[PDB]
Amino acid sequence: MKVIVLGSSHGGYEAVEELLNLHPDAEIQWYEKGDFISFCSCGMQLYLEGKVKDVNSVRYMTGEKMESRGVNVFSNTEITAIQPKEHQVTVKDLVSGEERVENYDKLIISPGAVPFELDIPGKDLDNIYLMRGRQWAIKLKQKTVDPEVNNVVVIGSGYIGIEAAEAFAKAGKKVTVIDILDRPLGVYLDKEFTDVLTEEMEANNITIATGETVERYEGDGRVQKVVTDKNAYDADLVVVAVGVRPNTAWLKGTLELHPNGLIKTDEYMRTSEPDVFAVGDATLIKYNPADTEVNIALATNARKQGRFAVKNLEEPVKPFPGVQGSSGLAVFDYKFASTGINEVMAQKLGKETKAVTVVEDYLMDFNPDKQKAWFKLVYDPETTQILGAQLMSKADLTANINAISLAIQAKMTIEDLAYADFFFQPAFDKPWNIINTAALEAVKQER
Ligand SMILES: Cc1cc2nc3c(=O)[nH]c(=O)nc-3n(C[C@H](O)[C@H](O)[C@H](O)COP(=O)(O)OP(=O)(O)OC[C@H]3O[C@@H](n4cnc5c(N)ncnc54)[C@H](O)[C@@H]3O)c2cc1C
C-alpha cells in the first residue's frame, strides 16, 4: 500500500506518524515543497523575543529522523497536480526542474494556508512583511535590531498581529496596531477582557487604532506611511497579519471546494474524490459548541484531523469527535485562554447565550500571593449547558480551560460545574475554585 502525504507541517506530519503505527508495512512518501521540514511557526514569538536563539531548532521533526524510520522524504519537491481517477500526482523537483508522475493507493493532503496580503496602492514597497514560516521569521528578527526601524505598524489585531506587536514593542520600537474591528483579540475574548489588555498594551507603547480601513501604503521605494480612511501613520516596517487564504487554487476543478476556497470534507476527512483525504487549515472542522462546521485554523485541529484521516484510510469507521476551538496566549503579564462560544462567535452563528463574569482574587485573603483573575462562563439560556469560557490573570491559571473544553463536549450544565469536585489547597486556589465560583453565580442568576 503506497500512501503519499503532502505537507510537512502539523497535518501532514501527524498523518505520517499514525501511518507508521497503524500501517508499518506501507511505502510512505512525504512531500514538502519548501526547504525545511516541520518548522513550527508556533515558536516564532519565542524566537523574535530572544528566548530561542537558533531558528533552526524551532521544529518538531527532521527528514533524516523520518528516513531512519523508513519514510521516503522529498523536500524541495512540490505536488503540482492530482489526477484522482487514475490515482496519480505530478510532482516537480524544484532544485532540478524535473517533473514526474507518481502513483498512489491513498493520498492525504494538508496544503495549508498562505498569508492574506492587502491589495492596495503601494502593495509592496520594501519593508511590508508577512508572518508565517522560517524565512519570514529570519527577516522579522533582523528588523528587531535594525536602528533604522523606529515605527512599526502591524495591520490585524488577532493572535498573530498581537504577537508581532509585543515582539517589536519589547525590542524597543514604537508600534501601532490598525484594524477595521473595534477591539483587539475580539475573536478570542470579550470586551471586559480586551479592555484590560488594551490598557496593558498602551502602557507598553503600542497604539491601537481600531475601526480604520487601510487605503494605501506611501513611500519612496520602501514604505514610509500607512494611510487609512481616518489617519496617516509613519511606518518604517509594516507587518501584515490580517488573516490567511487556503492554499487551494491549484485544486480548483480537481476537488470540490467551498466558495471561500476551503476543501469540502466529511467527518472521516474524505474529499469529493476516492482515496484522497484532506486535513488542516484548508478545511472546516466539526465545532461542538454549536454543532456546525467552522474553519478554525489551529495546530491542535490539524494534528487530530491528520490522525483521523489515517484511521479512515480503508473504511469510514471513525467519525471525527469535534473540537471546541480552545486557544491561549500570554500578552505581556497576562495569560489568557478561551474555548467555545464568545460574543463574536455567537453573533456570527446567530446563537443566543447568557454569561456571568467573576473578577476576584483566586487565592484566599490571608495568602499574600493572591492575585485577581477574570473568568466568564457562557451558557445556553434554555438548557443551561456550558457553551464557552474565558479566563485571564497574571498568574497562570490557563490549564483550567481544559476542564471547560471537556464540559462542553460532555454537555454538562452550570449546576454540574457549580458542584464539580475540584481540589482545594490554599497555595493553589479557594475552597470553591475559579470554575465553581462562576458556575455558582450562574446558578444564582437562574434561580
Ligand atoms: C505565527 C503563527 C503562530 C501560530 N501559533 C499557533 C499556536 O501557538 N497554537 C496553535 O494551535 N496554532 C498556531 N498557529 C496555527 C498553526 O500553525 C496552523 O494551524 C497549522 O500550521 C496548520 O497546519 P497545516 O498542515 O494545515 O498547514 P501549513 O502549516 O500551512 O503547512 C502546509 C505545508 O505543506 C506545504 N505545501 C503546500 N502545498 C504544497 C505542495 N503542493 N506540495 C508540497 N508541499 C506543499 C507547505 O510548504 C507547508 O509546509 C500559528 C500560526 C502562525 C502563522
- The C-alpha atoms of residue 415 and residue 118 are separated, in whole angstroms, by 47
Output the nine-digit C-alpha cell for 32.
514538502
- The C-alpha atoms of residue 140 and residue 132 are separated, in whole angstroms, by 10
Instruction: Assess contact for 100 and 90: CB atoms under 8 A.
Output: yes
Hey, CA dihedral for 21, 26, 32, 37, is it positive or negative?
A: positive
Question: Is residue 295 helix, strand or coil?
Answer: coil
Alpha-carbon separation of residue 317 from 275, 309, 313, 431 (angstroms): 14, 10, 9, 44
Q: What distance in angstroms lies between residue 9's CA and the mean position of ligand 1's atoms? A: 5
Alpha-carbon separation of residue 18 from 21, 69, 148, 169 (angstroms): 5, 13, 48, 41
Q: Whose CA is nearest to atom 17 of ligand 1?
A: 299
- The C-alpha atoms of residue 245 and residue 229 are separated, in whole angstroms, by 25
Q: Specify the ligand 1 atom closest to the Cα of 279.
A: 26
- The C-alpha atoms of residue 215 and residue 355 are separated, in whole angstroms, by 38
How was this one solved?
Answer: X-ray
Among 10, 14, 154, 255, say which to mutate for ligand 1: greatest number of ligand atoms within 8 Å of CB.
10
Residue for grid cell 496596531: 177
CA angle (372 as vertex; 367, 373 as ends), nearest 5: 120
Output the nine-digit C-alpha cell for 53.
536563539
Q: DSSP letter string over 116-171?
A: PPP-STTTTSBSEE---SHHHHHHHHHHHT-TT--EEEEE--SHHHHHHHHHHHHT
40 counts as catalytic: no
CA angle (185 as vertex; 179, 187 as ends), nearest 5: 100
Instruction: Assess contact for 167 and 49: CB atoms under 8 A.
Output: yes
Instruction: Assess contact for 122 and 226: CB atoms under 8 A.
Output: no
Is 243 assigned a ligand-binding role in the annotation?
Answer: yes
DSSP 3-state helix, strand, coil percentages of the chain (rounded to 5)? 30, 30, 40
CA angle (284 as vertex; 281, 287 as ends), nearest 5: 115
Strands 27-32 and 2-6: parallel
Helices (H) and strands (E) in the chain, counts: 11, 25
Is 281 assigned a ligand-binding role in the annotation?
Answer: yes
- Which residue spans within 197-294 are E strands per DSSP? 206-210, 214-218, 225-228, 232-234, 237-240, 244-246, 276-278, 285-287, 292-294
- The C-alpha atoms of residue 154 and residue 171 are separated, in whole angstroms, by 15
Phi, psi of 139 (to 5 degrees): -65, -40
- The C-alpha atoms of residue 83 and residue 310 are separated, in whole angstroms, by 21
Q: What residues line ligand 1, using a CB cutoff of 6 Å?
A: 6-12, 31-34, 41-42, 44, 78-79, 110-113, 131-132, 160, 247, 280-281, 297-300, 302
Instruction: Assess contact for 319 and 269: CB atoms under 8 A.
Output: no
Residue 391: Cβ within 10 Å count: 28
Is 42 assigned a ligand-binding role in the annotation?
Answer: yes
Q: Nearest Cα to 238, choosing from 214, 256, 266?
A: 214
- Which residue spans within 162-228 are E strands per DSSP? 174-179, 206-210, 214-218, 225-228
- The C-alpha atoms of residue 30 and residue 14 are separated, in whole angstroms, by 11
Domain 334-446 has CATH 3.40.50.12660: no
285, β-bridge pairs: 294
Among 79, 247, 279, say which to mutate for ligand 1: greatest number of ligand atoms within 8 Å of CB.
247
Assigned superfamily of 41-58+113-244: FAD/NAD(P)-binding domain (3.50.50.60)
Phi, psi of 204 (to 5 degrees): -115, 35
Domain 1-33+60-112+246-326 has CATH 1.10.287.90: no
Q: What distance in angstroms lies between residue 434's CA and the mean position of ligand 1's atoms? A: 34
CA angle (29 as vertex; 23, 35 as ends), nearest 5: 135
Q: Where in the chain is the domain with CATH 3.50.50.60?
A: 1-33+60-112+246-326, 41-58+113-244
Q: Specify the ligand 1 atom closest to the Cα of 133.
A: 53
Hey, CA dihedral for 198, 203, 204, 209, is it positive or negative?
A: positive
Residue 427: Cβ within 10 Å count: 8
Q: What's CA 80's distance to the chain center, in Å?
A: 26
Q: Where in the chain is the domain with CATH 3.30.390.30?
A: 334-446
Among 110, 114, 139, say which to mutate for ligand 1: greatest number of ligand atoms within 8 Å of CB.
110
